[PDB]
Design a protein around this ligand. Structure first.
Ligand SMILES: *C(=O)c1ccc(NC(C)=O)cc1
Ligand SMILES: *C(=O)c1ccc(NC(C)=O)cc1
Ligand SMILES: *C(=O)c1ccc(NC(C)=O)cc1
Ligand SMILES: *C(=O)c1ccc(NC(C)=O)cc1
Ligand SMILES: *C(=O)c1ccc(NC(C)=O)cc1
Lengths: 32, 32, 32
């Protein structure tokens, strides 16, 4: 159950990091 | 501990999933 | 290992909440 958790958390971290760069690019273009 | 972690991780996966769909829509809009 | 996981999931939860906040703001600014 835990080794399974570590995998998933690791995948989540990568997805969250990608969302972090898309979101920074968006905020910069949108401004306001 | 572990059941707690599994509930949390499931909930994150669905939230990341939702973030990913909103951000794809926003990139398409802002990117025109 | 479980305690490092718990902190990893805690940090992800915080990050997901902030991204949800920013994406909601951006949606409002971009419109429909
Ligand atoms: C949890 O991730 C987990 C559960 C059961 C086992 N069983 C093995 C490999 O014996 C591993 C990991
Ligand atoms: C940027 O979006 C970015 C760059 C590298 C990674 N790394 C992995 C392993 O996904 C994530 C996000
Ligand atoms: C983990 O979330 C966890 C830890 C302990 C228990 N209950 C018992 C009886 O150990 C449930 C869940
Ligand atoms: C998001 O990936 C998502 C949500 C719903 C569906 N399909 C239906 C029938 O709801 C596909 C994909
Ligand atoms: C896993 O996160 C983990 C395992 C052991 C310890 N602490 C000691 C003293 O072994 C911390 C964290």
């Amino acid at each position: 159950r835990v080794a399974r958790l570590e995998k998933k958390v690791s995948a989540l971290e990568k997805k969250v990091a990608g969302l972090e760069k898309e979101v920074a690019r968006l905020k910069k273009l949108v401004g306001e």
